[PDB]
Design a protein around this ligand. Sequence first.
Ligand code: PIO
Ligand code: CA
Ligand code: CA
Length: 140
Amino acid sequence: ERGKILVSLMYSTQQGGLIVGIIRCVHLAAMDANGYSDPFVKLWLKPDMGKKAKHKTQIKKKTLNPEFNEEFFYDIKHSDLAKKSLDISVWDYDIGKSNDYIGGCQLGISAKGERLKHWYECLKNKDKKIERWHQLQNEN
Ligand SMILES: CCCCCCCC(=O)OC[C@H](COP(=O)(O)O[C@@H]1[C@H](O)[C@H](O)[C@@H](OP(=O)(O)O)[C@H](OP(=O)(O)O)[C@H]1O)OC(=O)CCCCCCC
Ligand SMILES: [Ca+2]
Ligand SMILES: [Ca+2]
């Protein structure tokens, strides 16, 4: 068991871009010796591989159910966003050590189940926030 993450999507027509609302995560894997992790989420539109299109949340220190409530924005047209698969990666912050990898999940059309469904519902219903839970399982 390594938890799940509540993600929100909404394409704003007046602003022209995608709003990814990271709400929280629950029941994550304990990556530290104290029994916790220090989770923070990383968002990244995959096929660009350009650094001008990726974000990350603030470091929630010592919590297995972090409460982020952080929105991020990607300036991209609606036709160009249909090509994108937004990657999500939750990590554990170590203060004198490379960050432990907790989990991850990717939202795209080539994916299956709830990922393609969430991306698609984001693509169709605009000026409309769609929320969904996502199980971490990438092992990257
Ligand atoms: C260009 C030639 C001259 C320049 C020399 C350049 C030579 C060369 O090619 O190395 C570049 C390489 C790139 O490392 P790399 O891009 O993966 O560094 C991470 C990357 O930038 C992520 O995007 C960051 O996360 P984010 O942005 O926050 O999302 C992360 O920061 P943080 O999240 O951890 O804080 C970074 O750690 O760095 C090394 O030397 C390690 C390989 C050692 C090789 C060992 C193999 C034996
Ligand atoms: Ca750790
Ligand atoms: Ca830690």
